[PDB]
Design a protein around this ligand. Structure first.
Ligand SMILES: C=C/C(C)=C/[C@@]1(C)SC(=O)C(C)=C1O
Ligand SMILES: C=C/C(C)=C/[C@@]1(C)SC(=O)C(C)=C1O
Ligand code: NA
Ligand code: NA
Lengths: 415, 415
């Protein structure tokens, strides 16, 4: 008979530390309290930047605390932005975990991003066009390579049981946590730092996503712009983030006196084969990723008390996801869509929302989905709105999807 | 007991089709005959950018048959180069496999690459700089994203059991195969297209890698520049390539009448935590990735008849790998270093070399390692040289390594 977490085929895996930098706060516990108070991280983009390009999109959430304010002259010259974010969060995470001494040979790193050190691609291009190949830095390739951020974290923390970077566009941060779990349950590590990092709001990324019509243009009320599952939604809002969690076998946590925040029970990864930038409208393959996470966790759909939705606020996006949740037997769960308050951090967002899912399970509370005012009859979901929803949440699925047709679901459990 | 392939704990997985494009030939079987004939793919760079840029490196192997001679206006417009390569190889592989009707819900794609459609990053940057945000194509994000090539193949072939892109620099192509094996043995798929694709030789990649002093500058004699394990090696040579293989459960292959070319028995992924762009001299973590693939295969070091070496021809890289092979107890195996003839295709290379490992087992022969004229006194390996070696190769390990400190070993068996 097939292994599951419930039957003990797989070892039990626990979340023991979380860290995240957001548009609300650099401290995850403060982001969480803010969220519960109904605060938004979204603001007006300031301004001559927007004028310089007359961008259609004039709103987004920058990190409350900029990464580079913790970065010295050397690191600014020698790392890409995602590498600086990764190093910053990795050490904060390790601190929060009590700086444990782990066996490096059983310690893995899995961190996704959407792109990597792309700014260094354009910088190096400009440098060579102007002064030739001798103007390109010896450090360019290590800064540009998309595995750069995971590699800096593995080097910083001493991980010798594998350093991996799955790229799946907007599902990359969840997919990293899926693979870290796989790597533990398969026996290749006992402990893993996992999550996602992403670059900051910039003009060429706004222009690229804007030109697809994917983004909100409700510029007059920035906090009201990201409206997942709401009838008047008009696309996603950028909101900067990066987020990492520490996961380990329950045995490993026990031996060092770490108190678990949640259980990571299982993970499902499927694909649509439908379109490169539109999700399958039927939500069938997306719902099967949820189902697969349950099969591995040893749960039934009826066991799911909460779904932390990808919910980007695009018209077709939220609709396909509503169909996915119905397909999964999960449409009676309380649904939260965090992008309403924190916006979209692309490669980091899945990791961020995984942390949020953990805090929901830990605290028995789901924050309100902001801007949810006019129910959409094609979205027949129990969307948490108005005030937080308190409850004895025992099991939860965090969904993430990505351009390319990527579907990731993570089954978490209260500890 | 933990599962292995040998004890029936993991389902049996076979390789049923292979495809590759190479500096020697567009056809893998032709490339193979070429290698056995002692042919090199490496030539003088004739791109007028060499003098346009006065590059320190003036050698490499372009693909014998350029990808874009198979591409029409439409494909030229909507795909980045690695996407065009993937579509090309994807269709070729499927046709070679006899265009099987498989279950799309049990069919996965795992294709690695080093960077993605980075030429559309610089294109879009230039466009926006010259004409504003509206000069950025609606297609740019999906072309740029490093998961683009895997997604194109998944959409092309109809894969709905997951589409993944592991990025680990020069080991990406091997890691992709490792993860596709994991997806089948964990029960998520019964069949998978896997491998790696990479961009062509261009001025900016030469500049970046040549500023690391990583590349050979033996410009007078292109075919003699790539010298893995040789005392006179002075770095690596670019040789373009892309390569995919079809793997499926032995049961799935039997059902459709597909004759296996080899068995894929096990995969090991570890990390050095030593340096971003240099391997740990001790070869200890690299050796452990070999050992791990053996554990999972159910093999011992004595069973390993052949090692397909990453063998870049850098001074410190070959030295580190020779330590790794010894650590793994595999130093009595017959060693091939294919980059001697085919050069380095970065994100595609581990997949190409996994294909060549499969063929070694199929045909019971290892091609000669070119340029091996003065064995490095400090490296004592049985490097195959001079003429191909006909031998009873039962089992083989393919090694790949990547900037970031990534170690991937694939354990293959004769069918
Ligand atoms: C295959 C296409 C998919 C998953 C598209 C989604 C819904 S995922 C995402 O973050 C955005 C912006 C979308 O549009
Ligand atoms: C951690 C660094 C490693 C593995 C570096 C290697 C050996 S891998 C590779 O492809 C090349 C060109 C190198 O120099
Ligand atoms: Na989510
Ligand atoms: Na190899």
């Amino acid at each position: 008979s097939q292994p599951s977490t419930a039957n003990g085929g797989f070892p039990s895996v626990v979340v023991t530390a979380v860290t995240a930098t957001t548009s609300i706060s650099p401290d995850i516990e403060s982001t969480w309290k803010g969220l519960l108070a109904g605060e938004s991280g979204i603001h007006a983009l300031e301004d001559e930047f927007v004028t310089k390009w007359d961008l259609a999109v004039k709103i987004g959430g920058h990190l409350k605390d900029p990464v580079d304010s913790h970065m010295g002259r050397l690191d600014m010259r020698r790392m890409s932005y995602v590498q600086r974010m990764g190093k910053l969060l990795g050490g904060q995470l390790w601190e929060s975990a009590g700086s444990p001494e782990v066996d490096p040979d059983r310690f893995a790193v899995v961190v996704g991003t959407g792109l990597g050190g792309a700014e260094r691609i354009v910088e190096s291009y400009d440098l060579m066009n102007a002064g030739g190949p001798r103007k390109v830095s010896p450090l360019a390739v290590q800064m540009i390579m998309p595995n750069g951020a995971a590699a800096v974290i593995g080097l910083q923390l001493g991980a010798r049981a594998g350093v991996m970077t799955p790229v799946s566009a907007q599902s990359s941060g969840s997919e990293a946590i899926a693979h870290a779990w796989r790597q533990i349950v398969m026996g290749d590590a006992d402990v893993a730092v996992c999550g996602g990092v992403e670059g900051p709001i910039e003009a060429l990324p706004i222009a690229a996503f804007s030109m697809m019509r994917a983004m909100s243009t409700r510029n007059d009320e920035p906090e009201r712009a990201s409206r997942p599952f709401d009838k008047d939604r008009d696309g996603f809002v950028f909101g900067e983030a990066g987020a990492l969690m520490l996961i380990e076998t329950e045995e490993h946590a026990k031996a060092r006196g770490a108190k678990p925040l949640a259980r990571l029970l299982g993970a499902g990864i499927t694909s649509d084969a439908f379109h490169m930038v539109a999700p399958a409208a039927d939500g069938v393959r997306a719902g099967r990723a949820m189902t697969r996470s349950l099969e591995l966790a040893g749960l039934s759909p009826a066991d799911i008390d909460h779904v932390n939705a990808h919910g980007t606020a695009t018209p077709i996006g939220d609709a396909a996801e509503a169909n996915a949740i119905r397909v999964a037997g999960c449409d009676q769960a309380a649904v939260y869509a965090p992008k309403s308050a924190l916006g979209h951090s692309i490669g980091a967002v899945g990791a961020l929302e995984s942390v949020l899912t953990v805090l929901t399970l830990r605290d028995g509370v789901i924050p309100p989905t902001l801007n949810y005012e006019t129910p959409d009859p094609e979205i027949d979901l129990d969307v948490v709105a108005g005030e937080p929803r308190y409850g004895d949440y025992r099991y939860a699925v965090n969904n993430s999807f990505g351009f390319g047709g990527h579907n990731v679901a993570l089954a978490f459990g209260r500890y």
